PDB file of C-alpha atoms and ligand atoms in Angstrom:
ATOM      1  CA  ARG A   1     117.648 199.174  54.533  1.00 49.86           C
ATOM      2  CA  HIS A   2     116.423 199.548  50.954  1.00 49.65           C
ATOM      3  CA  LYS A   3     119.691 200.711  49.400  1.00 50.81           C
ATOM      4  CA  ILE A   4     118.698 199.270  46.027  1.00 51.27           C
ATOM      5  CA  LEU A   5     115.154 200.653  45.938  1.00 51.02           C
ATOM      6  CA  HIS A   6     116.485 204.090  46.885  1.00 48.65           C
ATOM      7  CA  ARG A   7     118.816 204.318  43.897  1.00 47.62           C
ATOM      8  CA  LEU A   8     116.184 202.891  41.546  1.00 49.81           C
ATOM      9  CA  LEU A   9     113.798 205.628  42.698  1.00 52.65           C
ATOM     10  CA  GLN A  10     116.387 208.348  42.154  1.00 52.78           C
ATOM     11  CA  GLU A  11     117.019 208.245  38.417  1.00 56.42           C
TER      12      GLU A  11
ATOM     13  CA  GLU B   1      86.141 216.807  35.172  1.00 54.20           C
ATOM     14  CA  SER B   2      85.977 213.501  33.309  1.00 52.54           C
ATOM     15  CA  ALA B   3      88.181 215.025  30.610  1.00 55.50           C
ATOM     16  CA  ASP B   4      91.128 215.163  33.019  1.00 58.72           C
ATOM     17  CA  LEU B   5      90.295 211.634  34.160  1.00 60.98           C
ATOM     18  CA  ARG B   6      90.516 210.274  30.614  1.00 61.39           C
ATOM     19  CA  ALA B   7      93.736 212.200  29.994  1.00 61.48           C
ATOM     20  CA  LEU B   8      95.115 210.680  33.197  1.00 64.44           C
ATOM     21  CA  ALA B   9      93.986 207.211  32.110  1.00 63.92           C
ATOM     22  CA  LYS B  10      95.734 207.672  28.761  1.00 60.27           C
ATOM     23  CA  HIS B  11      98.904 208.991  30.413  1.00 57.29           C
ATOM     24  CA  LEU B  12      99.076 205.903  32.626  1.00 57.10           C
ATOM     25  CA  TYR B  13      98.426 203.606  29.686  1.00 57.20           C
ATOM     26  CA  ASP B  14     101.213 205.275  27.705  1.00 57.11           C
ATOM     27  CA  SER B  15     103.639 205.024  30.633  1.00 56.88           C
ATOM     28  CA  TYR B  16     102.570 201.405  31.131  1.00 59.46           C
ATOM     29  CA  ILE B  17     103.564 200.704  27.525  1.00 57.50           C
ATOM     30  CA  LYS B  18     106.933 202.380  28.096  1.00 56.88           C
ATOM     31  CA  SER B  19     107.642 200.510  31.340  1.00 55.48           C
ATOM     32  CA  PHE B  20     106.376 196.997  30.611  1.00 56.58           C
ATOM     33  CA  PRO B  21     107.778 195.281  27.469  1.00 56.97           C
ATOM     34  CA  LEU B  22     105.434 192.272  27.384  1.00 57.84           C
ATOM     35  CA  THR B  23     101.868 193.562  27.586  1.00 57.59           C
ATOM     36  CA  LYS B  24      98.729 191.476  28.028  1.00 57.65           C
ATOM     37  CA  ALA B  25      97.861 192.313  24.424  1.00 59.27           C
ATOM     38  CA  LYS B  26     101.189 191.025  23.115  1.00 56.72           C
ATOM     39  CA  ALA B  27     100.994 188.058  25.489  1.00 58.47           C
ATOM     40  CA  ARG B  28      97.502 187.037  24.379  1.00 62.04           C
ATOM     41  CA  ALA B  29      98.681 187.389  20.777  1.00 61.33           C
ATOM     42  CA  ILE B  30     101.338 184.785  21.545  1.00 61.82           C
ATOM     43  CA  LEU B  31      99.180 182.476  23.667  1.00 62.44           C
ATOM     44  CA  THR B  32      96.627 182.254  20.855  1.00 65.53           C
ATOM     45  CA  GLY B  33      98.660 182.541  17.667  1.00 63.66           C
ATOM     46  CA  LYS B  34      98.165 186.043  16.275  1.00 66.42           C
ATOM     47  CA  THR B  35     101.892 186.222  15.539  1.00 61.79           C
ATOM     48  CA  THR B  36     103.649 184.049  12.965  1.00 60.13           C
ATOM     49  CA  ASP B  37     107.113 184.329  14.505  1.00 60.00           C
ATOM     50  CA  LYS B  38     108.665 181.294  16.182  1.00 61.62           C
ATOM     51  CA  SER B  39     106.098 180.284  18.789  1.00 63.25           C
ATOM     52  CA  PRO B  40     107.581 179.980  22.289  1.00 67.37           C
ATOM     53  CA  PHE B  41     109.401 176.751  23.115  1.00 69.20           C
ATOM     54  CA  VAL B  42     107.144 174.592  25.278  1.00 69.45           C
ATOM     55  CA  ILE B  43     108.599 173.190  28.502  1.00 70.85           C
ATOM     56  CA  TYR B  44     106.329 170.557  30.044  1.00 73.18           C
ATOM     57  CA  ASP B  45     108.762 168.095  31.627  1.00 74.95           C
ATOM     58  CA  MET B  46     112.378 167.494  32.637  1.00 74.65           C
ATOM     59  CA  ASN B  47     113.293 166.484  29.090  1.00 72.64           C
ATOM     60  CA  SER B  48     111.736 169.505  27.391  1.00 72.83           C
ATOM     61  CA  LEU B  49     113.396 171.734  29.987  1.00 75.58           C
ATOM     62  CA  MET B  50     117.005 170.649  29.544  1.00 78.11           C
ATOM     63  CA  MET B  51     116.900 171.281  25.791  1.00 73.54           C
ATOM     64  CA  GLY B  52     114.979 174.534  26.026  1.00 74.81           C
ATOM     65  CA  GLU B  53     117.331 175.898  28.681  1.00 75.17           C
ATOM     66  CA  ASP B  54     119.016 177.897  25.926  1.00 74.97           C
ATOM     67  CA  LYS B  55     115.959 179.509  24.344  1.00 77.61           C
ATOM     68  CA  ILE B  56     114.692 180.692  27.727  1.00 76.16           C
ATOM     69  CA  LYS B  57     118.033 181.492  29.354  1.00 79.56           C
ATOM     70  CA  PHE B  58     119.686 184.453  27.633  1.00 80.08           C
ATOM     71  CA  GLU B  59     126.448 176.395  36.927  1.00 78.96           C
ATOM     72  CA  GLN B  60     124.119 173.601  35.781  1.00 80.91           C
ATOM     73  CA  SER B  61     124.776 171.707  39.020  1.00 81.18           C
ATOM     74  CA  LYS B  62     121.678 172.631  41.033  1.00 83.40           C
ATOM     75  CA  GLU B  63     118.536 170.495  40.813  1.00 83.20           C
ATOM     76  CA  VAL B  64     115.674 171.481  38.508  1.00 84.54           C
ATOM     77  CA  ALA B  65     113.320 172.815  41.184  1.00 82.56           C
ATOM     78  CA  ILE B  66     116.057 175.125  42.471  1.00 80.85           C
ATOM     79  CA  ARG B  67     117.058 176.280  38.992  1.00 81.77           C
ATOM     80  CA  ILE B  68     113.475 177.156  38.086  1.00 82.72           C
ATOM     81  CA  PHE B  69     112.977 178.979  41.383  1.00 83.13           C
ATOM     82  CA  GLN B  70     116.091 181.080  40.790  1.00 83.73           C
ATOM     83  CA  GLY B  71     114.644 181.883  37.379  1.00 80.91           C
ATOM     84  CA  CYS B  72     111.442 183.131  38.973  1.00 82.74           C
ATOM     85  CA  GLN B  73     113.616 185.253  41.268  1.00 82.26           C
ATOM     86  CA  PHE B  74     115.497 186.874  38.386  1.00 83.92           C
ATOM     87  CA  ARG B  75     112.284 187.724  36.531  1.00 82.39           C
ATOM     88  CA  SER B  76     110.724 189.185  39.681  1.00 81.57           C
ATOM     89  CA  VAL B  77     113.795 191.386  40.123  1.00 82.15           C
ATOM     90  CA  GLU B  78     113.479 192.636  36.559  1.00 83.62           C
ATOM     91  CA  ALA B  79     109.773 193.197  37.208  1.00 85.12           C
ATOM     92  CA  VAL B  80     110.462 195.226  40.355  1.00 83.55           C
ATOM     93  CA  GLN B  81     112.591 197.552  38.232  1.00 84.57           C
ATOM     94  CA  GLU B  82     109.872 197.861  35.584  1.00 84.21           C
ATOM     95  CA  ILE B  83     107.255 198.566  38.257  1.00 86.18           C
ATOM     96  CA  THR B  84     109.476 201.143  39.938  1.00 82.38           C
ATOM     97  CA  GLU B  85     109.849 202.979  36.632  1.00 80.28           C
ATOM     98  CA  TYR B  86     106.091 202.869  36.151  1.00 80.59           C
ATOM     99  CA  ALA B  87     105.448 204.147  39.684  1.00 79.49           C
ATOM    100  CA  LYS B  88     107.678 207.145  38.998  1.00 80.68           C
ATOM    101  CA  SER B  89     105.423 208.071  36.062  1.00 82.02           C
ATOM    102  CA  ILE B  90     102.311 208.280  38.245  1.00 82.81           C
ATOM    103  CA  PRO B  91     101.525 211.978  38.778  1.00 83.45           C
ATOM    104  CA  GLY B  92     102.599 213.033  42.253  1.00 83.32           C
ATOM    105  CA  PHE B  93     104.603 209.917  43.136  1.00 84.59           C
ATOM    106  CA  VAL B  94     108.142 211.300  42.826  1.00 83.56           C
ATOM    107  CA  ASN B  95     107.130 214.325  44.908  1.00 83.64           C
ATOM    108  CA  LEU B  96     106.246 212.110  47.867  1.00 84.53           C
ATOM    109  CA  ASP B  97     108.721 211.776  50.726  1.00 80.70           C
ATOM    110  CA  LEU B  98     111.370 209.400  49.367  1.00 82.08           C
ATOM    111  CA  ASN B  99     110.976 207.078  52.353  1.00 83.22           C
ATOM    112  CA  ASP B 100     107.261 206.741  51.592  1.00 78.67           C
ATOM    113  CA  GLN B 101     108.037 205.947  47.951  1.00 79.47           C
ATOM    114  CA  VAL B 102     110.216 203.073  49.160  1.00 78.46           C
ATOM    115  CA  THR B 103     107.479 201.889  51.517  1.00 77.31           C
ATOM    116  CA  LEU B 104     104.841 201.947  48.775  1.00 78.33           C
ATOM    117  CA  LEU B 105     107.060 199.808  46.542  1.00 80.02           C
ATOM    118  CA  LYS B 106     108.115 197.460  49.348  1.00 80.30           C
ATOM    119  CA  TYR B 107     104.499 196.506  50.036  1.00 81.14           C
ATOM    120  CA  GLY B 108     103.182 196.954  46.512  1.00 81.79           C
ATOM    121  CA  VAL B 109     105.546 195.311  44.040  1.00 84.83           C
ATOM    122  CA  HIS B 110     104.595 191.710  44.762  1.00 85.47           C
ATOM    123  CA  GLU B 111     100.879 192.462  44.514  1.00 89.91           C
ATOM    124  CA  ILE B 112     101.684 193.939  41.108  1.00 91.17           C
ATOM    125  CA  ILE B 113     103.852 190.952  40.199  1.00 91.11           C
ATOM    126  CA  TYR B 114     100.893 188.634  40.825  1.00 93.57           C
ATOM    127  CA  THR B 115      98.673 190.950  38.805  1.00 92.55           C
ATOM    128  CA  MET B 116     100.960 191.162  35.794  1.00 90.03           C
ATOM    129  CA  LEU B 117     101.884 187.468  35.836  1.00 89.51           C
ATOM    130  CA  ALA B 118      98.225 186.783  35.076  1.00 85.81           C
ATOM    131  CA  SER B 119      98.672 188.672  31.803  1.00 89.32           C
ATOM    132  CA  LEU B 120     101.241 186.058  30.773  1.00 89.64           C
ATOM    133  CA  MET B 121      99.233 183.066  31.995  1.00 88.92           C
ATOM    134  CA  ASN B 122      96.424 180.863  30.795  1.00 90.35           C
ATOM    135  CA  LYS B 123      94.998 177.714  32.386  1.00 88.12           C
ATOM    136  CA  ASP B 124      97.836 175.649  30.937  1.00 88.13           C
ATOM    137  CA  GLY B 125     100.997 177.614  31.678  1.00 87.50           C
ATOM    138  CA  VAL B 126     103.016 180.826  31.718  1.00 84.84           C
ATOM    139  CA  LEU B 127     105.021 182.769  29.140  1.00 85.50           C
ATOM    140  CA  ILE B 128     108.645 183.318  30.122  1.00 84.17           C
ATOM    141  CA  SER B 129     111.760 184.872  28.605  1.00 82.01           C
ATOM    142  CA  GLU B 130     109.920 187.728  26.901  1.00 83.10           C
ATOM    143  CA  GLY B 131     107.504 185.245  25.366  1.00 86.04           C
ATOM    144  CA  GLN B 132     110.139 182.935  23.907  1.00 88.61           C
ATOM    145  CA  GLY B 133     109.303 180.185  26.374  1.00 88.29           C
ATOM    146  CA  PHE B 134     106.123 178.570  27.668  1.00 87.97           C
ATOM    147  CA  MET B 135     106.354 176.505  30.844  1.00 87.81           C
ATOM    148  CA  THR B 136     103.293 174.397  31.640  1.00 85.89           C
ATOM    149  CA  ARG B 137     101.323 174.799  34.860  1.00 85.60           C
ATOM    150  CA  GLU B 138     101.403 171.043  35.414  1.00 86.24           C
ATOM    151  CA  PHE B 139     105.195 170.856  35.190  1.00 84.72           C
ATOM    152  CA  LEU B 140     105.611 173.726  37.653  1.00 85.55           C
ATOM    153  CA  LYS B 141     103.013 172.287  40.019  1.00 85.35           C
ATOM    154  CA  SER B 142     104.847 168.953  39.913  1.00 83.95           C
ATOM    155  CA  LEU B 143     108.093 170.464  41.194  1.00 85.49           C
ATOM    156  CA  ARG B 144     109.064 168.874  44.498  1.00 85.14           C
ATOM    157  CA  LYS B 145     107.791 170.435  47.707  1.00 86.15           C
ATOM    158  CA  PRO B 146     107.890 173.135  48.752  1.00 86.93           C
ATOM    159  CA  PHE B 147     108.507 174.559  45.277  1.00 87.88           C
ATOM    160  CA  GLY B 148     105.433 173.229  43.497  1.00 88.84           C
ATOM    161  CA  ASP B 149     103.173 174.905  46.044  1.00 90.79           C
ATOM    162  CA  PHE B 150     105.132 178.112  45.476  1.00 87.05           C
ATOM    163  CA  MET B 151     104.225 178.199  41.784  1.00 85.66           C
ATOM    164  CA  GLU B 152     100.598 177.077  41.892  1.00 85.07           C
ATOM    165  CA  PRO B 153      99.110 180.002  43.869  1.00 88.24           C
ATOM    166  CA  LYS B 154     100.117 182.377  41.068  1.00 90.59           C
ATOM    167  CA  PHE B 155      98.073 180.333  38.584  1.00 91.57           C
ATOM    168  CA  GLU B 156      95.141 180.065  40.992  1.00 91.25           C
ATOM    169  CA  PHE B 157      94.957 183.851  41.161  1.00 91.22           C
ATOM    170  CA  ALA B 158      95.524 184.327  37.430  1.00 89.33           C
ATOM    171  CA  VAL B 159      92.617 182.027  36.565  1.00 88.35           C
ATOM    172  CA  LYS B 160      90.256 184.012  38.784  1.00 90.37           C
ATOM    173  CA  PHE B 161      91.671 187.387  37.769  1.00 92.72           C
ATOM    174  CA  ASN B 162      91.717 186.726  34.021  1.00 89.36           C
ATOM    175  CA  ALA B 163      88.021 185.828  34.154  1.00 85.89           C
ATOM    176  CA  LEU B 164      87.515 189.578  34.593  1.00 84.16           C
ATOM    177  CA  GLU B 165      88.840 190.205  31.073  1.00 87.55           C
ATOM    178  CA  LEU B 166      90.729 193.432  31.816  1.00 86.12           C
ATOM    179  CA  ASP B 167      92.868 194.960  29.078  1.00 84.21           C
ATOM    180  CA  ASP B 168      96.155 196.843  29.345  1.00 81.39           C
ATOM    181  CA  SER B 169      94.334 200.170  29.666  1.00 81.78           C
ATOM    182  CA  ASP B 170      92.321 198.841  32.616  1.00 83.20           C
ATOM    183  CA  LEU B 171      95.442 197.312  34.141  1.00 78.47           C
ATOM    184  CA  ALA B 172      97.530 200.486  33.961  1.00 79.19           C
ATOM    185  CA  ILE B 173      95.123 202.255  36.315  1.00 76.39           C
ATOM    186  CA  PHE B 174      94.452 199.213  38.508  1.00 76.14           C
ATOM    187  CA  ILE B 175      98.199 198.895  39.126  1.00 74.52           C
ATOM    188  CA  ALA B 176      98.524 202.616  39.882  1.00 74.98           C
ATOM    189  CA  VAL B 177      95.750 202.427  42.484  1.00 77.01           C
ATOM    190  CA  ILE B 178      97.487 199.535  44.247  1.00 72.51           C
ATOM    191  CA  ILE B 179     100.865 201.271  44.367  1.00 71.90           C
ATOM    192  CA  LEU B 180      99.359 204.437  45.845  1.00 71.18           C
ATOM    193  CA  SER B 181      97.903 202.659  48.891  1.00 73.01           C
ATOM    194  CA  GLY B 182      97.799 205.070  51.817  1.00 73.66           C
ATOM    195  CA  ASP B 183      97.476 202.321  54.421  1.00 74.23           C
ATOM    196  CA  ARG B 184     100.805 200.554  53.923  1.00 72.97           C
ATOM    197  CA  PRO B 185     102.580 200.069  57.275  1.00 73.23           C
ATOM    198  CA  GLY B 186     105.066 202.767  58.217  1.00 74.08           C
ATOM    199  CA  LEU B 187     104.003 205.524  55.817  1.00 74.41           C
ATOM    200  CA  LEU B 188     104.933 208.990  57.085  1.00 75.76           C
ATOM    201  CA  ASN B 189     102.596 211.272  55.129  1.00 74.20           C
ATOM    202  CA  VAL B 190      99.306 209.504  54.432  1.00 70.01           C
ATOM    203  CA  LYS B 191      97.122 212.333  53.128  1.00 67.80           C
ATOM    204  CA  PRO B 192      99.052 213.089  49.919  1.00 66.94           C
ATOM    205  CA  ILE B 193      98.988 209.402  48.996  1.00 68.78           C
ATOM    206  CA  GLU B 194      95.272 209.074  49.734  1.00 70.77           C
ATOM    207  CA  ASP B 195      94.584 212.173  47.633  1.00 71.38           C
ATOM    208  CA  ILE B 196      96.460 210.750  44.649  1.00 69.18           C
ATOM    209  CA  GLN B 197      94.721 207.400  45.069  1.00 72.09           C
ATOM    210  CA  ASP B 198      91.266 208.964  45.341  1.00 72.95           C
ATOM    211  CA  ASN B 199      91.796 210.562  41.933  1.00 75.52           C
ATOM    212  CA  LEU B 200      93.206 207.323  40.510  1.00 74.06           C
ATOM    213  CA  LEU B 201      90.165 205.439  41.823  1.00 71.81           C
ATOM    214  CA  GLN B 202      87.832 207.881  40.066  1.00 71.78           C
ATOM    215  CA  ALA B 203      89.883 207.388  36.911  1.00 69.36           C
ATOM    216  CA  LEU B 204      89.569 203.617  37.283  1.00 70.94           C
ATOM    217  CA  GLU B 205      85.820 203.781  37.855  1.00 72.83           C
ATOM    218  CA  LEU B 206      85.272 205.891  34.740  1.00 68.06           C
ATOM    219  CA  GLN B 207      87.618 203.672  32.723  1.00 69.09           C
ATOM    220  CA  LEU B 208      85.640 200.551  33.626  1.00 66.49           C
ATOM    221  CA  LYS B 209      82.318 202.293  33.007  1.00 63.52           C
ATOM    222  CA  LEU B 210      83.376 203.229  29.473  1.00 63.16           C
ATOM    223  CA  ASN B 211      85.490 200.190  28.610  1.00 68.49           C
ATOM    224  CA  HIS B 212      83.189 197.571  30.154  1.00 66.40           C
ATOM    225  CA  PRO B 213      79.664 199.073  29.773  1.00 66.73           C
ATOM    226  CA  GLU B 214      78.053 195.665  30.241  1.00 66.73           C
ATOM    227  CA  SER B 215      79.805 194.752  33.486  1.00 67.03           C
ATOM    228  CA  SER B 216      78.713 197.149  36.224  1.00 65.59           C
ATOM    229  CA  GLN B 217      80.231 194.922  38.916  1.00 65.60           C
ATOM    230  CA  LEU B 218      83.801 195.250  37.688  1.00 64.74           C
ATOM    231  CA  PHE B 219      84.982 198.221  39.775  1.00 65.53           C
ATOM    232  CA  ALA B 220      83.712 196.695  43.017  1.00 68.68           C
ATOM    233  CA  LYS B 221      85.265 193.339  42.148  1.00 67.12           C
ATOM    234  CA  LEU B 222      88.639 194.956  41.475  1.00 69.92           C
ATOM    235  CA  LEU B 223      88.545 196.716  44.843  1.00 70.13           C
ATOM    236  CA  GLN B 224      88.092 193.312  46.479  1.00 70.32           C
ATOM    237  CA  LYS B 225      90.932 191.878  44.390  1.00 68.82           C
ATOM    238  CA  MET B 226      93.180 194.571  45.844  1.00 67.34           C
ATOM    239  CA  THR B 227      92.169 193.299  49.274  1.00 66.44           C
ATOM    240  CA  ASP B 228      92.680 189.661  48.262  1.00 67.91           C
ATOM    241  CA  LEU B 229      96.162 190.401  46.934  1.00 68.58           C
ATOM    242  CA  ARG B 230      97.363 191.464  50.377  1.00 63.59           C
ATOM    243  CA  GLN B 231      96.469 188.096  51.885  1.00 61.04           C
ATOM    244  CA  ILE B 232      97.848 186.388  48.785  1.00 60.74           C
ATOM    245  CA  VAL B 233     101.217 188.123  49.102  1.00 63.17           C
ATOM    246  CA  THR B 234     101.391 187.521  52.844  1.00 62.93           C
ATOM    247  CA  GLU B 235     101.211 183.814  52.023  1.00 66.69           C
ATOM    248  CA  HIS B 236     103.821 184.209  49.279  1.00 64.74           C
ATOM    249  CA  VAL B 237     106.219 185.892  51.701  1.00 64.67           C
ATOM    250  CA  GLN B 238     105.657 183.283  54.409  1.00 63.08           C
ATOM    251  CA  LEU B 239     106.152 180.354  52.043  1.00 63.54           C
ATOM    252  CA  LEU B 240     109.340 182.089  50.933  1.00 65.73           C
ATOM    253  CA  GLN B 241     110.389 182.516  54.567  1.00 67.70           C
ATOM    254  CA  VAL B 242     110.052 178.740  54.879  1.00 67.65           C
ATOM    255  CA  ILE B 243     112.121 178.175  51.737  1.00 65.79           C
ATOM    256  CA  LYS B 244     115.119 180.276  52.769  1.00 62.76           C
ATOM    257  CA  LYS B 245     115.038 178.472  56.116  1.00 64.25           C
ATOM    258  CA  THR B 246     114.601 174.914  54.862  1.00 61.28           C
ATOM    259  CA  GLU B 247     116.684 174.840  51.673  1.00 64.42           C
ATOM    260  CA  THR B 248     120.452 175.076  52.183  1.00 69.41           C
ATOM    261  CA  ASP B 249     120.960 176.012  48.537  1.00 70.49           C
ATOM    262  CA  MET B 250     118.914 179.219  48.564  1.00 69.32           C
ATOM    263  CA  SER B 251     120.684 182.292  47.263  1.00 64.62           C
ATOM    264  CA  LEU B 252     117.913 184.831  47.784  1.00 66.19           C
ATOM    265  CA  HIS B 253     118.509 187.739  45.412  1.00 67.58           C
ATOM    266  CA  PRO B 254     119.617 190.897  47.277  1.00 70.98           C
ATOM    267  CA  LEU B 255     116.764 193.056  45.976  1.00 73.09           C
ATOM    268  CA  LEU B 256     114.218 190.468  47.102  1.00 70.45           C
ATOM    269  CA  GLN B 257     115.870 190.109  50.517  1.00 72.47           C
ATOM    270  CA  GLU B 258     115.689 193.885  50.846  1.00 73.19           C
ATOM    271  CA  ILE B 259     111.975 193.891  50.030  1.00 73.82           C
ATOM    272  CA  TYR B 260     111.026 190.913  52.213  1.00 77.65           C
ATOM    273  CA  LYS B 261     113.076 192.168  55.162  1.00 79.11           C
ATOM    274  CA  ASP B 262     110.874 193.323  58.049  1.00 80.35           C
ATOM    275  CA  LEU B 263     107.766 192.856  55.914  1.00 79.11           C
ATOM    276  CA  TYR B 264     105.412 192.859  58.902  1.00 79.36           C
TER     277      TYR B 264
HETATM  278  C1  CEK C 301     108.284 179.341  35.866  1.00 78.41           C
HETATM  279  O1  CEK C 301     108.857 180.658  35.659  1.00 78.41           O
HETATM  280  C2  CEK C 301     110.126 180.907  35.124  1.00 78.41           C
HETATM  281  C3  CEK C 301     111.064 179.881  34.871  1.00 78.41           C
HETATM  282  C4  CEK C 301     112.316 180.174  34.337  1.00 78.41           C
HETATM  283  O2  CEK C 301     113.197 179.151  34.105  1.00 78.41           O
HETATM  284  C5  CEK C 301     112.650 181.495  34.048  1.00 78.41           C
HETATM  285  C6  CEK C 301     111.742 182.528  34.290  1.00 78.41           C
HETATM  286  C7  CEK C 301     110.464 182.257  34.831  1.00 78.41           C
HETATM  287  C8  CEK C 301     109.527 183.443  35.065  1.00 78.41           C
HETATM  288  O3  CEK C 301     109.650 184.473  34.403  1.00 78.41           O
HETATM  289  N1  CEK C 301     108.517 183.424  35.955  1.00 78.41           N
HETATM  290  C9  CEK C 301     108.026 184.581  36.732  1.00 78.41           C
HETATM  291  C10 CEK C 301     107.494 184.178  38.130  1.00 78.41           C
HETATM  292  C11 CEK C 301     107.974 184.930  39.212  1.00 78.41           C
HETATM  293  C12 CEK C 301     107.566 184.656  40.514  1.00 78.41           C
HETATM  294  C13 CEK C 301     106.668 183.622  40.774  1.00 78.41           C
HETATM  295  C14 CEK C 301     106.163 182.846  39.732  1.00 78.41           C
HETATM  296  C15 CEK C 301     105.258 181.803  39.990  1.00 78.41           C
HETATM  297  C16 CEK C 301     104.760 181.034  38.942  1.00 78.41           C
HETATM  298  C17 CEK C 301     105.151 181.287  37.630  1.00 78.41           C
HETATM  299  C18 CEK C 301     106.049 182.315  37.347  1.00 78.41           C
HETATM  300  C19 CEK C 301     106.575 183.117  38.374  1.00 78.41           C
HETATM  301  O4  CEK C 301     112.247 183.778  33.942  1.00 78.41           O
HETATM  302  C20 CEK C 301     113.592 183.522  33.893  1.00 78.41           C
HETATM  303  C21 CEK C 301     114.544 184.448  34.206  1.00 78.41           C
HETATM  304  C22 CEK C 301     115.877 184.147  34.153  1.00 78.41           C
HETATM  305  O5  CEK C 301     116.744 185.205  34.189  1.00 78.41           O
HETATM  306  C23 CEK C 301     116.372 182.871  34.074  1.00 78.41           C
HETATM  307  C24 CEK C 301     117.857 182.539  34.022  1.00 78.41           C
HETATM  308  C25 CEK C 301     118.348 181.285  34.746  1.00 78.41           C
HETATM  309  O6  CEK C 301     118.645 183.271  33.427  1.00 78.41           O
HETATM  310  C26 CEK C 301     115.353 181.693  34.033  1.00 78.41           C
HETATM  311  O7  CEK C 301     115.620 180.551  34.402  1.00 78.41           O
HETATM  312  C27 CEK C 301     113.936 182.085  33.463  1.00 78.41           C
HETATM  313  C28 CEK C 301     113.955 181.962  31.919  1.00 78.41           C
END
């Protein structure tokens, strides 16, 4: 889960 | 060293200004009338809404309550992105285990959404669309169940919270403290988060001591507000669980689904 948050967190 | 604490406070304030376009300062300037630019368009009923739906919206078949709810969803998504960018500016955050960063945001963003919504609210309504719209509290509260009861709790908190009279400098640190909560469920490495938060809490205490000399109770009240926000968001999530279950026309935005998923 959290595919979107992951990429937001990594510039 | 208080010097480092003030430098930290200023760093957070500066990052806050970079990450969040509509500040409480700019919002209060609009709510009152400091600016001379076109005041926001006021939406207070079904009639005012349909004509303002072009000055606030930068389909048209779904009922009003649904349309307004979807709007709240889109703003919250934008806000999650703003908050994520702010979080990444907090010293130490990006060096945390990436999974813990996700966990901190998953449990934190909505508490921050409630907090920052207050900046755009007064007793009578909320600024929307980067300040170009103003939707009244009474109109939102009047939206058919369950949607009216979804809007109102945000105003109830904002009224209480705004009584504290924080400014953007206070808020920058308050928000940072909330994000760096070492007791969120499922965190892997607690100590490094607690250490960052301990320093942020000292920064907040000193900020309130200097910025609100005449209100010694403020720091303790803000700590309780952090506690209140957890219960407040739990209720938000639940009410939203009921909505996605009871309304057949509920396209829950993917980012929100991702955040709400397994939120217990
Ligand atoms: C009443 O609020 C709103 C109504 C509304 O019509 C809209 C709002 C908000 C908005 O920004 N509100 C933020 C918000 C988020 C979550 C819970 C809330 C509870 C009460 C008040 C505002 C709340 O922001 C919007 C974002 C969009 O992309 C829209 C569209 C369709 O493009 C909207 O339709 C807007 C212009």
